[PDB]
Nucleic acid binder design. Structure first.
Ligand SMILES: [Mg+2]
Length: 758
RNA sequence: UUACUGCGCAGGUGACGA
DNA sequence: TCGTCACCTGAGCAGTAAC
């Protein structure tokens, strides 16, 4: 067993002589870093200023002399390494600092892609795609108790349209509504100027503007987004444009794919190693071996968790390693107890889509047949219901109507339901042009609002989805059917876990930031989800209707304390029973929040039981990546020479970075989509230092199980449902807070068991 | 807004300290 | 009020759906 990292060992001196002096006000640090520039590295920490002489010659410095040892206090050399790595690469210019980030000098993938697919155009040479390397010096533990410093290498692509705006007009590219950014930017200033309304003389007209309502064509380029790229190129190349993207895709894979990335990291290391890195003029550092995660000798830095089982009965007999293979065979987890076996479902659609909807509904309810083995049985027989009655609600509305769409939908729903009687759920079909209208006239959010107020949960769908070719539709209907069943109060599947303790609660927090435009300032909302341990199973609990970011810390403990009281009454804990509480979020909580949570929970359950509490954070966007060299990968498809997910660690691999931090692999070769897919990056799982429960390996495995618990999809989610579901609830409820005639009254009455947020 | 995955860009934000 | 280490969020395009 061995997993290789994207980092290199850094040999540092055992000791270093530093000059220190008390400096309670950090305000004076910036001026001193300038005064001593060139001769001293300077660093502020815990009320004191530290000075490392990096070059002989004055000026001089006062204070106590102390020997800072690397093994004990690695943070000083780690910080110094940020600057020293830059100085060691003078022919590479820093596009950003800490981490030190720079670009490849020779390579440019659009040029190479033009040659490879054989395309040619004038302005093509003004669309630049340049590899981007970052070097992050990070502290890690080979074994518990000992800390070292490693330099980790990450690669990205810099997309940039330096083409002038006057050129893109004359070539027939419509610039109306494209975002625009500055060329020179600009001691700490903003880049985003605004959107393009039209161009005057040597002047652009900006709506949704960040500052001024206009700028010179010279002081403004398009932002290097996919959107802007695809929009420009397609107008300059179509239909030969798709040929360029496949070509560009091949080039990028030349840096992103496992073997390629491993190679690129290897080559980066040799280059950094080829000379000593001058920490000072007399003090040297040196890049060593590629850092590994292994169980070699005293080290215990890698394990593979078992496969996640999907469970479809209360005992645990019926199970599978995939959700859909399991559901097809056994049916949903709660079939025996599922109350409503003849659900009436409202279907709201533009009258002009009648025929296309009927077929989609036919496929959904009654299946696509054995020719399309992804979705054969159809919703009814799949979930083990008697039947599904549709109440058809056509809407006199057209895609071109972008101001009256929402009132037309709501009028039609209102008038339909007035007769009709009670409906248990609804499906709403949307025009592509209506899907992203502002919330004041968006039919998605307004129908959602109306129907959720009335206690009717909805699964919505856009017309391009309804019109998918059969081969895609079958997978679409898998997800559609799973979510709809869950919105009808269903429990499709669970994941295995054998209870070691008498009860286990996991609560998660998710964040949404809402805004009508980029210019407009973003308002923050928060959601809370809960997962319980059961007999052999994890069970999704109740969900918040509380919303605002302010007092989020209070909302957490109220959810926790109220739930703990409910759990204690329900399960009636014995003296000496252990209760565990775990918190998940994408950010760490404050120490004061942890202390407060801990106190309130502890006293609420009382002294009769033992309380274990852990506060976990989950990162997607860190500098670590895992490489498994024993992984040959899988056929890109049955059955070619190309392979996908080469060098990709198995799903469930857990690597030890430190005492509080683990790396979790989630995307196996099986799940990786195609040959050009980059090497996956693992989830970083971090335990808050004030946690009373400590087994982070267990918690990393628990987080993995919770990615399989999502009923949005048949395939696992990117993050555990505790956070993911909470983000969805934060977005919806945040958006609904601005829709008139919205009430949450039914969220814990008619919708109490509905997973309406999927 | 069936989703998953990936990526680009943009905005910044979080925690810890004194 | 600021240093320091860290990485989150939203929008949108494109390819593919775990023996
Ligand atoms: Mg959904």
């Amino acid at each position: 067993r061995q997993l290789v990292s994207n980092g290199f060992e850094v040999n540092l001196p055992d000791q270093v002589e530093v000059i220190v002096r008390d400096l309670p006000d950090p305000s004076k640090v910036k001026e001193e870093r300038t005064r001593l520039m060139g001769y001293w590295f300077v660093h502020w920490f815990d009320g004191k200023l530290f000075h490392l002489r990096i070059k002989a010659g004055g000026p001089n410095v006062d204070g106590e002399h102390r020997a800072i040892r690397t093994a004990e206090h690695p943070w000083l050399l780690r910080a110094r390494l940020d600057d020293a790595l830059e100085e060691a690469l003078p022919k590479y210019a820093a596009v950003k600092k800490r981490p030190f980030t720079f670009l490849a000098q020779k390579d440019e993938l659009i040029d190479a892609a033009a040659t490879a697919a054989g395309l040619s155009h004038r302005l093509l040479n003004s669309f630049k795609v340049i590899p981007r390397f970052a070097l992050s010096p990070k502290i890690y533990e080979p074994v518990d108790g000992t800390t070292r410093v490693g330099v980790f290498v990450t690669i990205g692509m810099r997309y940039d349209i330096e083409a002038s705006l006057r050129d893109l007009l004359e070539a027939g590219i419509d610039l109306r509504g494209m975002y625009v950014v500055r060329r020179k930017r600009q001691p700490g200033e903003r880049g985003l100027l605004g959107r393009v309304r039209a161009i005057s003389d040597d002047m652009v007209q900006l709506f949704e503007e960040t500052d001024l309502a206009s700028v010179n064509v010279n002081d403004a380029k398009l932002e290097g987004s996919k959107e802007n790229f695809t929009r420009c190129l397609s107008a300059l190349l179509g239909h030969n444009y798709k040929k360029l993207l496949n070509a560009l895709d091949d080039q990028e894979a030349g840096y992103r794919t496992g073997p390629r990335f491993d190679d690129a990291v290897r080559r980066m290391g040799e280059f950094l190693a080829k000379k000593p890195i001058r920490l000072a003029d007399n003090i040297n550092a040196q890049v060593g071996d590629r850092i590994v995660f292994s169980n070699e000798g005293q080290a215990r830095n890698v394990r593979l968790a078992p496969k996640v089982e999907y469970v479809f009965d209360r005992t645990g007999a019926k199970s599978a390693e995939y959700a859909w293979r399991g559901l097809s065979q056994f049916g949903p987890f709660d079939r025996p107890s599922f109350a409503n076996r003849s659900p009436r479902i409202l279907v709201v659609y533009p009258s002009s889509t009648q025929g296309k909807v009927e077929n989609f509904l036919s496929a959904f309810r009654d299946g696509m047949g054995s020719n399309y083995s992804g979705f054969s049985k159809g919703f009814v027989d799949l979930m083990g219901l008697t039947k599904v009655e549709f109440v058809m609600c056509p809407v006199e509305v057209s895609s071109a109507d972008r101001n009256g769409a929402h009132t037309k939908y709501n009028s039609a729903i209102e008038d339909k339901l007035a007769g009709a009687g009670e409906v248990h759920a609804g499906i709403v079909v949307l025009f592509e042009d209506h899907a992203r209208l502002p919330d004041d006239r968006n039919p998605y959010i307004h129908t959602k609002s109306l129907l959720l107020t009335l206690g009717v949960p909805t699964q919505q769908v856009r017309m391009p989805t309804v019109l998918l070719e059969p081969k895609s539709l079958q997978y679409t209907l898998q997800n559609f059917s799973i979510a709809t069943y869950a919105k009808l109060n269903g429990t499709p599947w669970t994941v295995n876990h054998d209870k070691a303790i008498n009860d286990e609660l996991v609560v998660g927090m998710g964040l949404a930031e809402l805004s009508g435009s980029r210019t407009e300032k973003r308002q923050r909302f928060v959601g809370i989800t809960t997962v319980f341990a059961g007999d052999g199973s994890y069970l999704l609990g109740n969900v918040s209707k509380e919303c605002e970011y302010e007092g989020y810390s209070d909302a957490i403990r109220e959810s926790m304390t109220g739930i703990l009281r409910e759990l204690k009454k329900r399960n009636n804990w014995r003296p000496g029973d252990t209760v565990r509480v775990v918190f998940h979020a994408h950010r760490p909580l404050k120490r004061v929040d942890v202390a407060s949570i801990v106190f309130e929970c502890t006293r609420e359950i009382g002294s009769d039981q033992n309380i274990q509490m852990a506060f976990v954070t989950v990162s997607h966007d860190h500098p670590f990546v895992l490489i498994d060299r024993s992984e040959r990968g899988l056929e890109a498809y049955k059955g070619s020479t190309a392979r996908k997910g080469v060098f990709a660690p198995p799903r469930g691999a857990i690597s030890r970075v430190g005492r509080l931090t683990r790396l979790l692999a989630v995307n196996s070769p099986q799940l990786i989509k195609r040959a050009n897919t980059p090497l996956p990056t693992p989830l970083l799982v971090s335990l808050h230092p004030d946690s009373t429960f400590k087994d982070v390996d267990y918690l990393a495995e628990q987080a993995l199980k919770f990615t399989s618990l999502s009923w949005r999809s048949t395939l696992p989610a990117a993050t555990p449902v505790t956070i993911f579901y909470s983000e969805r609830i934060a977005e919806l409820l945040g958006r609904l807070k601005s829709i008139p005639n919205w009430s949450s009254a039914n969220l814990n009455i008619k919708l109490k068991w509905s997973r309406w947020f999927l």
